[PDB]
Paper text:
In the other class of self-sufficient P450s, CYP116 P450s contain an N-terminal [name] domain fused to a phthalate dioxygenase-type reductase domain that consists of a NAD(P)H reductase domain and a [2Fe-2S] cluster-containing domain (ferredoxin) at the C-terminus. The electron transport chain of these P450s is NAD(P)H→FMN→[2Fe-2S]→[name]. Notably, [name] from T. thermophilus is a highly potent and thermostable protein. A more recent report describes its activity in catalyzing region- and enatio-selective C-H-lactonizations of saturated fatty acids.
The [name] domain is very similar to the recently reported N-terminal region of [name] (denoted [name]-N), albeit a small structural difference is observed with Cα root-mean-square deviation, Cα RMSD, of 1.154 Å27. In particular, helix αB’, αE, αF, and αG in CYP116B5-N and [name]-N adopt various conformations.
Numbering used by the authors: 28 to 445
The structure:
C-alpha cells in the first residue's frame, strides 16, 4: 500500500485501460496518497473529488492543461513568432474573473439553443455512415467519430462554410500535449499548428465582427464584448475558438468511442437499444459513468488545506481519478453493474461538478446519442472485430485510438428484405 503509492505512474496501459481498477486499492483503503514520480497528490473517492471540485478558490484549475513534458524553448519561440496570446479560457481560469466571464458567455450553451444544431448533427452522422456502410469492415474512429465533433464545434462557434473547409488541417490531437508527456518533436509539431491556427483565427474574428448579428457563439460573444468591454478582452475572444475546439472535439470522440465499445461488448444491452432506441439517452449516460472518457482531472491548491486528514501545502498538485469516483461503491450501488436503467447515472463526474461544470455537456450528449442511434438503426448486425485496444498515455482522457467493427452489408436493414 506504501509501495503502490511510491510506484504510482499513470503513464502506462493499465491506468489508461481501467483506471478505476488500477487505483481500487486506494479507493478502498488509501483515499489520499502522494505520488513522488508525478509530484501530485492522488484522490480516488467520489465524495473527496466532489469536495475539491466544490471550492474553485482553494482548489484552482490552473494545472488542468499543464503538460508533463519538460518546457520547450523552441515551442516558446514558435508561439511568439505567431503572436500567440491564448488566455486561460474558462476551463483553467481562476476566480473571480472565471465566473464573471462564464455568466456573460454561457447563454448559447442552454439546451433551448443547442436544439437548433440537432439537424446539422443528424446530417453529418448520416453522411459519415453512408461513406462506409457498404464495405463490411470499418474503424469507427477514423471513419466517423474523430471528425464529427470537430465539425460540430465549428458550427457551434458559427464558422462560415469556406472557413470550415480551410480548418480541416487543424483537427489534430491535443490530448498528449496538454495532459501527457509529448516528445520534444510532438511538442514542436503541435506548437507550429497552434500558432498557425492563432493566425487563422485572428482573420476569422475580424470577419465575424463585420457580421456580429449572425449566428454562433463567437458573434454572440462579440455582441457581449460591446455590453461588457471590461470583462471580455480581444485576446480572450481570440482564444475562444481554440478553447471550444479543444473542449468539444477529442472529449466527445473519446466518450462516443468508449460508449460504442461498451454497448457492443454488452451484447444483451446492444440488443435492447436496437429494439428500443428511446433507451439511448439513459444508455449513453451509463456509458459515461461506467466507461467514461475522463480518467483523471486536476487542481492545484492556493492555500494550505486539509484533504482526507492530510494538510496539503500551498501549490500542491492534485490528480482526481474521476473514473475511480464513477466506480465508487460508496456512491454508486453495484458500480461494476453496467445498468442503462441506473437512475443516478448522470451523477458521474466526467463533466466535473460545480463552478466549471462542462458548459457543452448537453451538446456532447446529443452527439453521442445521435451517433449511437444512427449505428444501432443502420448497423444493428455489426460486431466488434478481433483487435488490440491502444490508449494514448496521459492523465486525463482515455479511449482506444481505433474501434474496428464488421458486418454483412447484404444484411444491412436498409437493404434487407421484409
Ligand atoms: C463528452 C464530451 C465532453 C466531456 C467529457 C467534457 C468534459 C469537460 C470537463 C471535465 C470540464 C471541466 C469540468 C470542471 O472543472 O468542473 C469541461 C469544461 C468545459 N467544457 Fe466540456 N466536455 C465535453 C464536451 C464539450 C463540448 C461539446 C463543449 C462545447 C460545445 C464543451 C465546452 C466546455 C467548456 C467551455 C468548459 C469550461 C467551463 C468552465 O470552466 O466554466 N465541452 N468539459
Amino acid at each position: 500500500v506504501h509501495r503502490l503509492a511510491e510506484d504510482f505512474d499513470p503513464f502506462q496501459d493499465a491506468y489508461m485501460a481501467d483506471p478505476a481498477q488500477f487505483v481500487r486499492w486506494a479507493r478502498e483503503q488509501v483515499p489520499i496518497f502522494y505520488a513522488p514520480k508525478l509530484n501530485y497528490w492522488v484522490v480516488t473517492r467520489y465524495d473527496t473529488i466532489k469536495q475539491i471540485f466544490r471550492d474553485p478558490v482553494t482548489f484552482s484549475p490552473s494545472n488542468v492543461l499543464q503538460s508533463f513534458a519538460q518546457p520547450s524553448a523552441e515551442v516558446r519561440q514558435v508561439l511568439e513568432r505567431y503572436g500567440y496570446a491564448f488566455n486561460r479560457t474558462l476551463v483553467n481560469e481562476d476566480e473571480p474573473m472565471h465566473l464573471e466571464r462564464r455568466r456573460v458567455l454561457m447563454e448559447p450553451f442552454a439546451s433551448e439553443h443547442l436544439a437548433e444544431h440537432e439537424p446539422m448533427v443528424r446530417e453529418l452522422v448520416r453522411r459519415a455512415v453512408n461513406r462506409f456502410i457498404d464495405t463490411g469492415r470499418a474503424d469507427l474512429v477514423d471513419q466517423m467519430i474523430w471528425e464529427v465533433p470537430f465539425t460540430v464545434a465549428l458550427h457551434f462557434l458559427g464558422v462560415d462554410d469556406d472557413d470550415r473547409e480551410k480548418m480541416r488541417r487543424f483537427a489534430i490531437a491535443h490530448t498528449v500535449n496538454a495532459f501527457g508527456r509529448p516528445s520534444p518533436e510532438e511538442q514542436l509539431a503541435v506548437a507550429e499548428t497552434v500558432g498557425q491556427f492563432w493566425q487563422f483565427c485572428g482573420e476569422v474574428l475580424e470577419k465575424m465582427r463585420r457580421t456580429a448579428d449572425g449566428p454562433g457563439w463567437m458573434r454572440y460573444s462579440i455582441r457581449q464584448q460591446k455590453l461588457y468591454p471590461d470583462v471580455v478582452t480581444d485576446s480572450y475572444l481570440h482564444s475562444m475558438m481554440q478553447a471550444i475546439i479543444v473542449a468539444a472535439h477529442e472529449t466527445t470522440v473519446f466518450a462516443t468511442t468508449n460508449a460504442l465499445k461498451t454497448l457492443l461488448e454488452h451484447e444483451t444491452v446492444w440488443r435492447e437499444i436496437c429494439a428500443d432506441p428511446s433507451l439511448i439517452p439513459a444508455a449513453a449516460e451509463e456509458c459515461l459513468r461506467y466507461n467514461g472518457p475522463v480518467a483523471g482531472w486536476r487542481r492545484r491548491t492556493t492555500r494550505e488545506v486539509e484533504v482526507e486528514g492530510v494538510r496539503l501545502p500551498v501549490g500542491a498538485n492534485i490528480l482526481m481519478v474521476v473514473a475511480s469516483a464513477n466506480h465508487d461503491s460508496a456512491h454508486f450501488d453495484d458500480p461494476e453493474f453496467f445498468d442503462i436503467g441506473r437512475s443516478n447515472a448522470s451523477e458521474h463526474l466526467n463533466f466535473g461538478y460545480g463552478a466549471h461544470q462542462c458548459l457543452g455537456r448537453n451538446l456532447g450528449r446529443m452527439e453521442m446519442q445521435i451517433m449511437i442511434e444512427e449505428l444501432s438503426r443502420r448497423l444493428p448486425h455489426m460486431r466488434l472485430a478481433e483487435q488490440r485496444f491502444d490508449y494514448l498515455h496521459n492523465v486525463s482522457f482515455r479511449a482506444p485510438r481505433h474501434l474496428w467493427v464488421e458486418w454483412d452489408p447484404a444484411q444491412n436493414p436498409e437493404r434487407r428484405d421484409p
